[PDB]
Enzyme design. Sequence first.
Site, mmCIF file in Angstrom:
data_model
loop_
_atom_site.group_PDB
_atom_site.id
_atom_site.type_symbol
_atom_site.label_atom_id
_atom_site.label_comp_id
_atom_site.label_asym_id
_atom_site.label_seq_id
_atom_site.Cartn_x
_atom_site.Cartn_y
_atom_site.Cartn_z
ATOM 1 N N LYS A 1 0.915 -0.879 -0.042
ATOM 2 C CA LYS A 1 0.097 0.002 0.166
ATOM 3 C C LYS A 1 0.925 1.398 -0.012
ATOM 4 C CE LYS A 1 -2.869 2.667 3.210
ATOM 5 N NZ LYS A 1 -3.554 2.858 4.360
ATOM 6 N N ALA B 1 -9.568 5.485 4.415
ATOM 7 C CA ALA B 1 -9.395 6.186 5.517
ATOM 8 C C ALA B 1 -10.409 7.584 5.723
ATOM 9 C CB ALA B 1 -8.128 7.096 5.655
ATOM 10 N N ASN C 1 -9.317 2.303 9.634
ATOM 11 C CA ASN C 1 -8.548 2.002 10.927
ATOM 12 C C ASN C 1 -9.282 2.609 12.240
ATOM 13 O OD1 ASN C 1 -5.123 1.926 11.834
ATOM 14 N ND2 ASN C 1 -6.896 0.477 12.641
#
Lengths: 223, 230
Positions: free
Chosen positions: B86, B173, B195
Amino acid sequence: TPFVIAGRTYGSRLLVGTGKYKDLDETRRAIEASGAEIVTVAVRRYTILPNTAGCYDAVEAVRTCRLARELLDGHNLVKLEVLADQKTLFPNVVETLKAAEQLVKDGFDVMVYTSDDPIIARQLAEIGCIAVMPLAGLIGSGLGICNPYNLRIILEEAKVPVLVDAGVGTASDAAIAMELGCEAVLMNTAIAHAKDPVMMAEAMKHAIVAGRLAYLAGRMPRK
Amino acid sequence: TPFVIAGRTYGSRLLVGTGKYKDLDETRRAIEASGAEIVTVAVRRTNIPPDRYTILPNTAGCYDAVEAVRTCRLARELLDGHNLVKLEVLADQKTLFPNVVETLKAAEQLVKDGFDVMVYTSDDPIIARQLAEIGCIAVMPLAGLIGSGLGICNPYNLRIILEEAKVPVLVDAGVGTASDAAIAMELGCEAVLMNTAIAHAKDPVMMAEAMKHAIVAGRLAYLAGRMPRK
């Protein structure tokens, strides 16, 4: 306060575009109603702001700027505008960074069109540029502010004047821009494409002043 | 339908991050609840069973293409030559906003270096276009700033990126709750990665289960084809 760009200070914080009207009578009566002091024109097609509309490379934008600087008798005021494709008309920030750098070390006073990306907007002010003008919405989409979040960051850290350029749909869109903290706003399609162009102009004229006063006035919180 | 990335096909369309929990018991029980199959870890700040999960080493912490490129090489060899990475070149520890110029730099280097890059980026549809052109298995425009818990902040640009996406698109995100993720899928994303939204909810393991349903609910709704707006 004073709306100052490249030394010169202006009264109207409403830059306005051209070429979208039906004729000169209209555009004349319109930008007249808008109360605009700075009006931009697409060179490839008061205070006049020659813009590189139509360019797709830094090399093209840079050439159009040189060729407009001499038709206007050495005037360094330019609106850099390197787009990606005739489809999205979305800025190609990489080419814009390229041309912006070249134009700055070439004596120009660049007002640069760009995305809402706060870091590239940061570099543009670093490599020079009198003012950075992130878009509000896609060009001619009449969508207004599509990313107020990024717009706020750009304003919070702006070390140069910030002008929301293009994408506006109505009066309120422009009022909001000012409320967020923009030093000025620039539009074209919203005015020239309203059913009655000259009125929309007068509308935006009040729109940007109303929001500008509201910004300074300091609005009440939200219950 | 089948969620396929770099040849491999997965079941969960919910990638999940690490390092934000309180301990391993938690992260273990959480990414377990999330139902995630691919879990990303910040190589530069964290050194779960890879016989059970596909691990996505990310260059979190890098600020140059040179740093991102080095972290990727050093993670490719700790994971026994696994090319899945990533790419994540940020601007500054403040905004944690992507530096798309450096990202383009590293993305190009990593691709001709045998890597399978899933690239983090802004909602800029033209740079997202070039990233898929210079390679990249998947382009992952953000939803909102990292850890801002804001959700989709620019659905307009997000739609353009999806309309012209020639590779998988993952909203990465910025998510705040279940609905944020559901919306992403509804818009057309192939998967979502989060996350902070999970690890920072008052009860992390539940938020995981929530997102687990969140991304499946919106994914079904996308395929189902919703009714118009009268």
